[PDB]
Design a binder for this molecule. Sequence first.
Ligand SMILES: [Mg+2]
Length: 147
Amino acid sequence: PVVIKTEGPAWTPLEPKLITRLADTVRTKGLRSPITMAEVEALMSSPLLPHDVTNLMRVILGPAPYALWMDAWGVQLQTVIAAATRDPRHPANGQGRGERTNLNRLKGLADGMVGNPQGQAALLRPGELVAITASALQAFREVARLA
Ligand SMILES: [Mg+2]
């Protein structure tokens, strides 16, 4: 998640305990359990960075489900990109001419974001995190749907 500090946007990791806790919930209750779904939604109630979502899912999901989540997330992000491309006023876009979002940014792969949650927090816009988070969540639901 991101919190606005004095110097600006800063990265704050999701509590390790809640992540472990959810991993247990997923393992004990299953992906299609209202308990799991509720807990995942709760953990994803605060806008997350690419770094947050991928590591969250990698940990709470098995290798196969995680591979499925990654494909689902890619599809979801692409739908966001298609919408942000068609509508300049899309919230994922910045107000400025050179501020349209792209798939690299949403995946945290753009210049200065690669493997760096601090850089992602400093570079991604609030609207991009919203899309990244909603996309990750929908991808989770898809994985649970196909479970
Ligand atoms: Mg794949």
